[PDB]
Symmetry: C3
Subunit: 437 residues, 3 copies
């Protein structure tokens, strides 16, 4: 469970040519909402796995993802003209299709073959249920299908999405969602029956079961009746977490914790009902805030302004390191265990720590980190095999391996959740929970 | 035409002791307007070729250029008292003349010889037609006269000047003014006869002729009548560009692209009539803006506020990297090929690229860069000889070599512009264009 | 007197494991006002000698000083809950006493021994006359008593305190207070009898006498009557300066110039009467400003806002590098030798120089720096012995060695101030000056 500086480096470094950056590049990356690029409209800057890029939707409705720098003499592609089914650099007129193929160089002789030989760096994009996905691996023609992540396979009326930039490395943010025991402590109310059933037993015991695409982490608690309440969080490779539903207005939430660069993470959150249209009231509260506080989702109107040249320029929060997440001491005294003004914010402020990259060689884990330690083991084993022998993880070529659900089961004391919950943990089209969360 | 990382380094690095910084130091540097330092008034911070300095005009009207740091115990010289024909550090009273010679140390015994031995680093300044020039080379007593650049030799009523800081390395900005084919593309209007004659032929062919002080770059276009329209841009060592005049209210513009440091450039722009007082209307539009947009010059009231301790503290634009040059997508859609709100801004946003120093080893040149490639050849050859054998460029000791003009000639198809334009490309006191631009 | 780059490095570097950082760690560090942490109230971030920490006062009134980072999984301790005589990280509930001992880990089994073995990095704090002191040395059980610095031993009604962050390395700020000749120059009025008696003789001669805890620096001036006026500034190890009193409303001022990190200094200033309650008018002017200008103390309401996560978040001035200390040229012309709007500000702007760490290998000292040079000699000798042989300075284990006062004596021409001022330079409980300042 104890990590060297070297192990820490293998996990946090995601830039081009790095171990973890190479392994991340074997998977499709969910990187933007469909709505963010309008056909023939403004391009949108992103940065993914350390690389600065520009997405645009052409007039025929197709999205390309290209270098942010023009390959001619280096002008910014975000200032290009998106029209006639291409993005054209305004400096000398080089025009690129969504594929990256250059289509015109107006300043060059018309006989010139330079144009047909020219490509801007570009990555294939797929689009599903309002989400754009990119494949950044070296062999696009050998890319598998999108992963069978249920949240992105249900009709859109069943799902609610948000995204935000968090100012820390991806893995310490991901860990925060495989950490069942934190929630009652960090997110609880001062003083006072209980508020969640997790509040009933503050020290779950842990059991973890590896499968082809990650690990199931069962947090086993005692119930005031001497049954077991098992919350099973799911990790799916390389950067997915699934959160076990609560009692009221039960839904399946989770994130892809997409590394923007070594210091920043795109926190793509989803909340879905597996079988019914999503709760209308919940949807609105995600978007507008709840009792004046952020939910687990980022609300729609609480982002700062950034220029178009910044990556994810519309996803930087008004709650950030530079203002200590608008921490409110008085509310910590009077009402909330933590004075951060919302659910995701409480998570972000803790997990982002006092520097953007956690040094795990300095940490001191307890039993509450059992699941965290086990998930790291999966990552490290995978990345090391990739470095040692060039072997890819099974899950990088197996879309059907992602058909998982987190579950919150009530079972006899000492029960085997892996058997009792076998069916409920299986994702299926339009199948309901199969139990009472 | 293909540059190594190493060649790129030789060109972009301008700090003390570097190859290009050594070669730049062989030439007089135009570095401030006369009006910027009033006799006995406030000193003004500058940084040139990587060095932080303070200019001041003493009570007798003479300008000195000295270290920004007091040589005693390091106090900032910009806070010194400019009076009694010296600048005096307020910490312990050391007073320096424009030459750098220390004149008084009030806290020292009056017998002490330390004072007469003490000099602050200082560089010789010359003043001509409202422009201050500095010589930063190691052997001031062997400095040639100022270069015979016509723009700075005409009476002031014939010339209009602006300066601005651009947040990129000097050479990529200079290149933008030896790049005839860019202009119709970057600076054109959406949709629609034509607007400039350059718009008639979007792919000039290129011919370049080296001379003692740089290179003449002839962009040859076709005319709708089967004559040739040749625009000859001029590069003069080490950092001058001359722009061929347009048809209406023809004038000769250009820049010295003065390296402030490796990441910043002082863009000193001049526009002159060679024989008549400058167009009054043009002058005002440079100063005030044109249809609410910047011209090629920076307007007088569109700079941000900076503290006196910053170099060129009054020349940082309100249009800058941090706000994406106030890019306006709607105007790009409706009216302008590029949505940057002015001529210089369109140039700056493209040429400054996505990082302050362009890596030319990553670029992909075409025929439109013929002149750019040829100018780099001149620079690289010069800097390499200087490194290899210590040989100075001819033009570093030949003021009369700078007597050039850019020209825009109409000539028979296939004509020899070098002969037909021989006289028009020669600068002479009060001589008119000698043709119709 | 001439320092190598290497000597400069030995003096300016104060982080963990460095020479000067090791030697500083042998002494108690005055680091906060008592009033800054209320019992059971908000914790307060500090950084000392390169280390980021959190101070808190528990419900029983005791102060702890702990790592700013939770030793579990790295959450910020400044967001912890200060209650029930501990500070508890909100992420997983780890609770720490003022000693650093962990008291609870709610998420762990109740049998678990991890808790009793766990400590957060913590340092012992002592409290005296409204000042909190920390011991950061490796052997706390062998720490001497607090130093017998009189300013912190008188009843509080005799003393006035301020603190501010200055954006430069500690030693160049400390030097400014062992530099008698600066004051009449930097702090004087334009044109015009005199204003201080230091203004009568602008070039004192210097004599220095080392003692166990530092050096006495006598600046000897001529009086308009042919007597001697000796101002004796005191340096006490490692970072104390004592300022000789003036004529009117004489008081003893000084600072501990506490290194926050290599680039920042906590300027803890004290002004006391040795025998009477402090002048009420003086006290108010320190707090409110004097004729609209800062005194030597920072006024109470001229700090910028910083988030709770910044060290010394309430001590960053509105007069700072980023705004050139609100320098006012017009006032420099009309009224003040230096246009900085106050006494400490004039000091700060000069001594902070043009970069945060002065490179002494580039300086050019004169006789006015005699005391500065001698104080450096004491520091360098001490730090070198510590590195060479592991020997600690005498003064690091001798509280009674700090019982010193600066003095401003009137004595016969050529007198021996060390004998004439022997008694006046001795600090004693409630003893008056023993002369007329
Ligand atoms: N995102 C949820 C996860 C809840 C859980 O792990 O049970 C939180 O931060 O509380
Ligand atoms: N400064 C002018 C140069 C014009 C030319 O090269 O012809 C521009 O940016 O358009
Ligand atoms: N802090 C005082 C010290 C005065 C002295 O050294 O005499 C000043 O800056 O002027
Ligand atoms: S820089 Fe993009 S076309 Fe020339
Ligand atoms: S620092 Fe300039 S005179 Fe002393
Ligand atoms: S990070 Fe502080 S208790 Fe877990
Ligand atoms: Fe949480
Ligand atoms: Fe241009
Ligand atoms: Fe002073």
């Amino acid at each position: 469970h104890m990590l060297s500086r070297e192990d820490n480096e293998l996990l946090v470094r995601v830039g081009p040519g790095t171990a973890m950056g190479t392994m991340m590049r074997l998977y499709w990356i969910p990187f933007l909402k469909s709505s963010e690029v309008t056909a023939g409209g403004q391009p949108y800057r992103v940065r993914l796995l350390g690389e600065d890029l520009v997405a645009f939707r052409d007039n025929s409705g197709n999205v390309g993802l290209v270098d942010h720098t023009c390959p001619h003499r280096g002008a910014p592609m975000v200032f290009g003209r998106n029209e006639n089914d291409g993005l054209r650099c305004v400096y000398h007129g080089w025009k690129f299709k969504v594929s990256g193929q250059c289509e015109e160089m107006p300043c060059e002789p018309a006989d010139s073959p330079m144009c047909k030989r020219m490509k801007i760096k570009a990555y294939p994009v797929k689009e599903r249920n309002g989400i754009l996905w990119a494949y950044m691996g070296p062999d696009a023609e050998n890319a598998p299908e999108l992963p069978d992540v249920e949240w992105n396979m249900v009709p859109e009326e069943q799902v609610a999405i948000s995204m935000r930039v968090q100012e820390c490395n991806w893995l310490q943010a991901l860990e925060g969602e495989l950490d069942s025991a934190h929630a009652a402590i960090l997110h609880g109310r001062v003083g006072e029956i209980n508020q969640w059933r997790q509040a009933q037993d503050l020290s779950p015991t842990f059991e973890c079961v590896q499968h082809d695409a990650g690990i199931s982490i069962g947090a086993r608690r005692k119930t005031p009746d001497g049954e077991n309440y098992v919350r099973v969080n799911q990790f799916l490779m390389p950067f997915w977490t699934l959160v076990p539903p609560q009692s009221q207005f039960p839904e399946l939430s989770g994130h892809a914790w997409v590394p923007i660069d070594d210091e920043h993470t795109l926190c793509l959150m989803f909340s879905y009902h597996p079988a019914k249209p999503f709760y209308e009231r919940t949807r609105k509260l995600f978007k507008e805030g709840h009792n004046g506080r952020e939910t687990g989702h980022h609300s729609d109107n609480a982002f700062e302004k950034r220029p178009v040249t910044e990556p994810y320029h519309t996803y930087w929060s008004k709650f950030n390191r530079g203002n200590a997440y608008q921490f409110d001491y008085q509310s910590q005294v009077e009402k909330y265990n933590s004075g951060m003004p919302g659910l995701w914010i409480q998570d972000a402020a803790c997990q982002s720590g006092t520097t953007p990259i956690l040094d795990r060689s300095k940490e001191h884990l307890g039993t509450s980190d059992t699941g965290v330690a086990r998930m790291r083991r999966v990552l490290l084993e995978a990345v090391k095999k990739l470095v040692a022998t060039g072997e890819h993880p099974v899950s990088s070529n197996a879309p059907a391996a992602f058909r998982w659900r987190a579950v919150s089961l009530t079972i006899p004391l000492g029960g085997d959740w892996t058997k009792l919950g076998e069916e409920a943990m299986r994702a299926e089209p339009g199948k309901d929970f199969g139990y009472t969360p």
